[PDB]
Amino acid sequence: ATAAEIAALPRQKVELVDPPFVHAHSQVAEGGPKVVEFTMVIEEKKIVIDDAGTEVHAMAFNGTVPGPLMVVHQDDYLELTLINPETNTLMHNINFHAATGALGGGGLTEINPGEKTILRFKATKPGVFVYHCAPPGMVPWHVVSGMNGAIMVLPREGLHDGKGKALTYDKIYYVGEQDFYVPRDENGKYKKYEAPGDAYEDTVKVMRTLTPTHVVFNGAVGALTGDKAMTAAVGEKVLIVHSQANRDTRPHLIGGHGDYVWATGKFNTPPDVDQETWFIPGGAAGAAFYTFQQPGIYAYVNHNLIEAFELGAAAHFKVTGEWNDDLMTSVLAPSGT
Amino acid sequence: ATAAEIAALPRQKVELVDPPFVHAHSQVAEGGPKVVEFTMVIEEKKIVIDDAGTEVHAMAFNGTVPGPLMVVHQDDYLELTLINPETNTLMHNINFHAATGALGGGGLTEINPGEKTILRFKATKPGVFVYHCAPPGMVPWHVVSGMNGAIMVLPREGLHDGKGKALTYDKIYYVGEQDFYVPRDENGKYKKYEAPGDAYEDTVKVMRTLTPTHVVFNGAVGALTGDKAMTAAVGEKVLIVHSQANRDTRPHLIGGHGDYVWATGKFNTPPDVDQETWFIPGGAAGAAFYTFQQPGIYAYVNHNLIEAFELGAAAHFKVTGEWNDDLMTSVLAPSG
Amino acid sequence: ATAAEIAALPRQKVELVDPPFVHAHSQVAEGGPKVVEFTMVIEEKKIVIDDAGTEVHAMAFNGTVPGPLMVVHQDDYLELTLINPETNTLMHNINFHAATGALGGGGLTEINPGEKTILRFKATKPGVFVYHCAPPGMVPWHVVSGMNGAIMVLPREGLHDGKGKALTYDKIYYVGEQDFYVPRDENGKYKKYEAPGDAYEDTVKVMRTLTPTHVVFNGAVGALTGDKAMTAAVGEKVLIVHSQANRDTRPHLIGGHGDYVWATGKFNTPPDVDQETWFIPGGAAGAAFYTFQQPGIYAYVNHNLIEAFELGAAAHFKVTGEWNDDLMTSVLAPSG
Ligand SMILES: [Cu+2]
Ligand SMILES: [Cu+2]
Ligand SMILES: [Cu+2]
Ligand SMILES: [Cu+]
Ligand SMILES: [Cu+]
Ligand SMILES: [Cu+]
Ligand SMILES: [Cu+]
Ligand SMILES: [Cu+]
């Protein structure tokens, strides 16, 4: 398309919502290609990542870890206004794995505190894709400080299974998984720092061990539990988009399955089916589609069970509906031999 | 199926066999859906896992690490009686990744020492699937103490390739891979404990490093080597089911291939072909089909070679038959 | 084929070149099956792997880490002359994941210093495949000393997508990724040694932590940058072959994609498409095909970003051509 043709396209402003929720969108595209406009302000901010009160100096797109999910359709243009407020201390940028050229956009979006930039790219490939900050010389430090999220580029005709049958979800959640590398003192207790920069050298040491201290969903141990548990009902079709910008994960819905899993995150690659545990390599997003069949509590985890239950990578679903004794029944409840 | 229809299905008891062997079964289903009955007794016992006398307080379905492979067909029911003897000291349960609801069954099967339970579930999805104990709040500890196995839910019409041609194995083995996290004293010597709970805090510290001290098949270094090597013959078709309930692995048949590999373990997902090394994520089972073409010794390993040859994740096959010089020949033997 | 039939086939001698370049070859086979002849000399040599002058006692096929890429077509025979000079100190051999029997060839190729051997195998399965040394009892040590490479067995009709459409590359590069485990002294400084055997015990201790000190392409931090950046132009189709003989990796072309990726490395397994980051398990090779659409610098990384940017797993592409503002444009450049 020419500059004139792109200028002629309709514009649509989108208001982002915080993960694990996803902004309003249509599964099947409404009309022809559009220029879809998003705005995010970067916030360097202290966050608490566990019940003990462990602090991280987060670097957060739109003030959240992960950054919010942006949704467009194939061959739309994504136009992001990215703002680095003067209250921040570092240069930041953005790299979309969905985009083509200039390192995913990082080469065109280097902004110092007090600067903004507007990047437009054509969403040429359908799938879920990571985005993250990547300042030359400081790449993993920004990413593992939480400066990452994902986008979804839906096919214009919505999702289909590997054989061309439509797959329409009732609801969608975005689970961003974060590996954190928090320095410890000689007592083995987590350290706190005055400024983000004070934590650099100690943190790099931990990063080099390749062993995170915390592996969390939505920025903290237990963030998607209790009154923040995800919800569904028997019969409800749910898409769960999962990203990890730096490190492998292996998602598993305990008590359920991934009926269709785009494990590579890319919708022109046919989905795997009937999955127990799927695998998403660091630097990627994946998506699983499931129809709930049983009520009750589910745990959605990274199925390295140490990572899930010792390091924090566990979320819950609360599911309403009627129990199905055909699928599963307690023939004899625990009782004396 | 209606209530009377489910109640009318035949019930069949099956006797289990210790890994890597697999109980008798048919690849193509015999007759209509059945309720297939298994029984397992949980054993808490000390096992020795290496050549240095290193001990683990194992938590073992049916007394083995891994637990035995249960085989059913799609839309059968699996009905397990699980028994926790009063001589044990921990609560246990069971979670089948093949099952739907109640965390895979764990929510319905929490049994204290001196209790039993019976769980039934419908095997709605074909594939190999992990099962493991998962007491809330102590999940990874039970699993990395060896309390895991797998099941196979065969399609009612047996296995097929991506093009619908039947794939019929002559034999099947089940390799369960176990990551252990054994505490060491400040001299680097592995520690021993009186009771399983005594090791809990020290073990969790090791677990949190995400670095196993041992990675083994069938519960110990060299368990499937030497006089306990698996066997085959040239021309024989072998299915190798492999599971890892907690941690990634990358199986490789040294000297062979995975001709067809269901790397995700699910038979409705077409198999990869001609594989050198396949990948099974922690919390899953996979299966590889191979027709042996050369005799001699093979090594079957996790192809992180440090995990295989320093930490224990290496098995052998001994294969009989005639050497094929077309496939491979020594044109000039090692010489000065 | 019979011995007589094989003896009658045409022979072609190949001259190998240093990675990341690949020796002259045709994508579509030229004529019927041939016996393709290669020669490699093993060199035990010091390599410097970072800008701090850190040394590895490399065990290098053809003097490079990785060893060179060998290219044949399906149902050709690969005939390798392998030489272990008298100047070396250790026994070596070679195991081809592409081959069938004798552990991939290792059982037939054990050569002491001053010996040579010739191995022939039939390349029956199309794909990219790891090769590596594997002396019984010292397997991972040789591998993580850089003694590994890959081969490509092209289909006789060249590459195709999952729907039978031809995929023809303009350029091919081979990136061998290496995990190193370098001992450190009490002050955290990397140790140096004056013979390969002197490093053994210290190196095994680091290996057992499963935590590499360095993760590098082409044997060194920054190797495939600057004078060794890979090159292309807008419109050019490039195949990137990537191997890792011991440890998982997750390749990613920063600023681009893998348009078609044989993540398992096997050409009869249809490629994944539109990939952001693909996954290659330790013990395997994979290949990605991409058509460049933008000029500029690209980084090609293992997308564990600590591995890429702290431990060394980062390469560059320098791409010439016209910028495409439809694909991407700066609507407002960084400004107050
Ligand atoms: Cu990236
Ligand atoms: Cu599980
Ligand atoms: Cu190998
Ligand atoms: Cu940054
Ligand atoms: Cu940043
Ligand atoms: Cu248990
Ligand atoms: Cu060697
Ligand atoms: Cu060797």
Show me where the domains of chain B are located.
8-155, 156-322
Yes or no: say if B259 and B276 are a contact pair by the CB < 8 Å rule: no
CA distance A278 to A286: 9
CA of A231 vs chain C CAs: smallest distance (Å):
30
Q: What are phi and psi of B126, to 5 degrees?
A: -80, 140
Which protein residues have their CB within 5 A of the ion that is ligand 5?
A 59, 92, 133, 142, 147
HEC profile for chain A?
CCHHHHHCCCEEECCCCCCCCCCCCCCCCCCCCCEEEEEEEEEEEEEECCCCCCEEEEEEECCCCCCCCEEEECCCEEEEEEEECCCCCCCECCEECCCCCHHHCHHHCCECCCEEEEEEEECCCCEEEEEECCCCCCHHHHHCCCCEEEEEEECCCCCECCCCCECCCCEEEEEEEEEECCCECCCCCECCCCCHHHHHHHHHHHHHCCCCCEEEECCECCCCCHHHCEEEECCCEEEEEEEECCCCECEEEECCCEEEEECCCECCCCCEEEECCCCECCCEEEEEEEECCCCEEEEEEECCHHHHHCCCCEEEEEEECCCCCCCEEEEEEEEEC
Return the ligand number nearest the Cα of B132: 2
CA of B213 vs chain C CAs: smallest distance (Å):
8
| Tokens of residue A216, six digits | 């969390």
Q: What is the dihedral of CA B56, B61, B66, B69, to 10 degrees?
A: 170
- Closest partner CB to A273 (pick from B121, B144, B268): B268
CA angle, corner A192, sides to A191 and A195, nearest 5?
Answer: 135
CATH code for the part of the protein at A8-155: 2.60.40.420
CA angle, corner C108, sides to C103 and C112, nearest 5?
Answer: 120
Interchain contact, C306 vs A210, CB within 8 Å? yes
Ligand 8 centroid vs C146 CA: distance in angstroms? 10
CA of B44 vs chain A CAs: smallest distance (Å):
17
Fold match, B8-155 / B156-322? yes
**What spatial distance separates the first Cα and last Cα of chain A, rounded to whole Å?**
75
Cβ contacts (< 8 Å) between A256 and chain B: which residues?
100
Neighbours of A89 (CB within 10 A): 12
Q: B151 forms bridges with which residues in the sheet? A: B70, B129
- Closest partner CB to C303 (pick from A126, A268, A282): A282
A117: closest CA among A147, A82, A152, A141? Answer: A82
Chains near B with 3+ CB pairs less than 8 A apart are A, C
Q: B37 forms bridges with which residues in the sheet? A: B13, B79
Cβ contacts (< 8 Å) between A327 and chain B: which residues?
99-101, 121-122, 124
Interchain contact, C265 vs B255, CB within 8 Å? no
Cβ contacts (< 8 Å) between A309 and chain B: which residues?
137, 139-140
Q: What is the resolution of this structure in A?
A: 1.6
CA distance B173 to B40: 20
Could you tell me the CATH superfamily of domain A156-322? Cupredoxins -  blue copper proteins (2.60.40.420)
Ligand 3 centroid vs C120 CA: distance in angstroms? 18
Q: What is the dihedral of CA C20, C25, C28, C29, to 10 degrees?
A: -130
A51: closest CA among A168, A222, A212? Answer: A222
B73 is in an annotated binding site: no
Place of tokens 């055909």: A326
Place of tokens 């195949």: C239
Yes or no: say if A169 and A237 are a contact pair by the CB < 8 Å rule: yes
Hey, of A310, A326, A335, which one would you mutate to test binding to chain B, going by the most B CBs within 10 A of its CB? A326
Size of interface B-C (CB pairs under 8 A): 164
Neighbours of C333 (CB within 10 A): 14
**What spatial distance separates the first Cα and last Cα of chain B, rounded to whole Å?**
74
Where is the binding site, in residues of A?
92, 97, 132-133, 142, 147, 303
Nearest Cα residue in chain A from C252: A283
B57 is in an annotated binding site: no
Nearest Cα residue in chain C from B271: C269
C302: closest CA among A246, A105, A132? Answer: A246
Interchain contact, C255 vs A100, CB within 8 Å? yes
CA of A6 vs chain C CAs: smallest distance (Å):
8
Query: Residue A182: CB partners within 8 Å, gap ≥ 6?
Result: A49, A54, A56, A190, A191, A203, A206, A213, A214
HEC profile for chain B?
CCHHHHHHCCEEECCCCCCCCCCCCCCECCCCCCEEEEEEEEEEEEEECCCCCCEEEEEEECCCCCCCCEEEECCCEEEEEEEECCCCCCCECCEECCCCCHHHCHHHCCECCCEEEEEEEECCCCEEEEEECCCCCCHHHHHHCCCEEEEEEECCECEECCCCCEECCCEEEEEEEEEECCCECCCCCECCCCCHHHHHHHHHHHHHCCCCCEEEECCECCCCCHHHCEEEECCCEEEEEEEECCCCECEEEECCCEEEEECCCECCCCCEEEECCCCECCCEEEEEEEECCCCEEEEEEECCHHHHHCCCCEEEEEEECCCCCCCEEEEEEEEC
Ligand 3 centroid vs B253 CA: distance in angstroms? 8
CA distance B173 to B66: 12
CA distance B293 to B302: 22
Return the ligand number nearest the Cα of C95: 3
Cβ contacts (< 8 Å) between A274 and chain B: which residues?
125-127, 266, 268-269
- Closest partner CB to B246 (pick from A296, A305, A336): A305
Method used to solve the structure: X-ray
Query: Residue C275: CB partners within 8 Å, gap ≥ 6?
Result: A264, A266, A269, C257, C258, C259, C261, C263, C288
CA of B5 vs chain A CAs: smallest distance (Å):
11
CA distance C144 to C178: 7
CA distance C144 to A103: 31
Size of interface A-B (CB pairs under 8 A): 168
